[PDB]
């Protein structure tokens, strides 16, 4: 077993957790839960979502 990374929020994905999304252009997205999955289909920007890893590295926090 290997640990994947959530494409939206960057949280750890353990075996069986979350979903795999294959976009029409053959790109693969991994979501740890339906929370980040819903924000992704709602087109939210993880750089503008305050709890994601992308937001925190962009704002240089921790």
């Amino acid at each position: 077993m290997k640990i994947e990374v959530d494409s939206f929020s960057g949280s750890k994905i353990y075996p069986g957790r979350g979903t795999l999304f294959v976009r029409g252009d053959s790109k693969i997205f991994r979501f740890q839960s339906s929370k980040s999955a819903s924000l992704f289909q709602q087109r939210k920007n993880p750089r503008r979502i305050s709890w994601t890893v992308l937001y925190r590295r962009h704002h240089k926090k921790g």
Binding site: G16, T19, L20, F21, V22, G24, S26
Partner: protein, 131 residues
């Protein structure tokens, strides 16, 4: 010639999927599924990797108005793999084949499910990205 595990059915009879090969069809309307037994009131339904009897609702006139076999290559209904992974594609798509499983077209646009590529070698040959 293969034994794929059960998958969540995505395409009941009457469903219209995308046609992902260059055969000239743009729609594929499911009217039957190969291997569907008997159950009162239950619609036959197909998953990725299933052979289907379909018509071309939209496409070239010589492809239209005929019954032809087709194989579902991707589905938008999420399904669980035996390794625990739930995955889904952006759309439902299929390709026109023979009764033997040999494609009519020569290329496939978009990804192809690994269940279908593992089960139909010709579609694997004509397929690009296989997920």
């Amino acid at each position: 010639s293969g034994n794929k595990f059960r998958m969540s059915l995505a395409l009941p009879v009457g469903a219209v999927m995308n046609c992902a090969d260059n055969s000239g069809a743009r729609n594929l309307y499911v009217l039957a599924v190969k291997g569907t037994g008997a159950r009162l009131n239950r619609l036959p339904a197909a998953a990725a990797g299933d052979m289907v009897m379909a018509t071309v609702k939209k496409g070239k006139p010589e492809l239209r108005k005929k019954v032809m076999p087709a194989i579902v290559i991707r589905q938008s209904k999420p399904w669980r793999r035996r390794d625990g992974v739930y995955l889904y594609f952006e759309d439902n798509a299929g390709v026109i084949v023979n009764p033997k499983g040999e494609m009519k077209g020569s290329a496939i646009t978009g990804p192809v499910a690994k269940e279908c590529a593992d089960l139909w070698p010709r579609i694997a040959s004509n397929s690009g990205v296989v997920v």
